[PDB]
Design a protein around this ligand. Structure first.
Ligand SMILES: [Ca+2]
Ligand SMILES: [Ca+2]
Length: 126
């Protein structure tokens, strides 16, 4: 639980659109995956604020975000394909959406990310 709520409007829009028929874990994951992709307008630039290896601290890296991972990944958690801008600029990886923040993106893309970060802080429902 966390108080990451402007009002119960978010909970009701999750309930009446994203997960309305979903409660089996695969459906919960797919409901989130479908509406998050559709809201996000990839490609976009972001910071991979990777949870550190040392502690609950952050090891940031600057990345280009190509798209959400396959549905085969997105059954377990929200994930995104990413390419390192910092040095490689020629190779690709995958990151949790839970460890990404967008940079200079449109409002709808940024809202999907912020809303997912609220769900992350809330402690999930699947
Ligand atoms: Ca069901
Ligand atoms: Ca889309």
């Amino acid at each position: 639980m966390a108080s990451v709520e402007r009002d119960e409007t978010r909970e009701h829009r999750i309930e009446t659109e994203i997960i309305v028929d979903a409660e089996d874990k695969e459906e919960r994951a797919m409901g989130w995956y479908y509406y998050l992709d559709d809201t996000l307008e990839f490609p976009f630039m972001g910071k991979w604020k990777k949870k550190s290896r040392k502690t609950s601290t952050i090891e940031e890296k600057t990345v280009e975000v190509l798209g959400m991972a396959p549905d085969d990944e997105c059954l377990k958690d929200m994930y995104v394909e990413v390419a390192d801008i910092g040095g490689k600029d020629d190779d690709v990886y995958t990151a949790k959406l839970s460890d990404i923040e967008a940079i200079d993106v449109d409002d709808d893309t940024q809202e999907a990310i912020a809303d997912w970060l609220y769900w992350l802080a809330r402690g999930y429902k699947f």
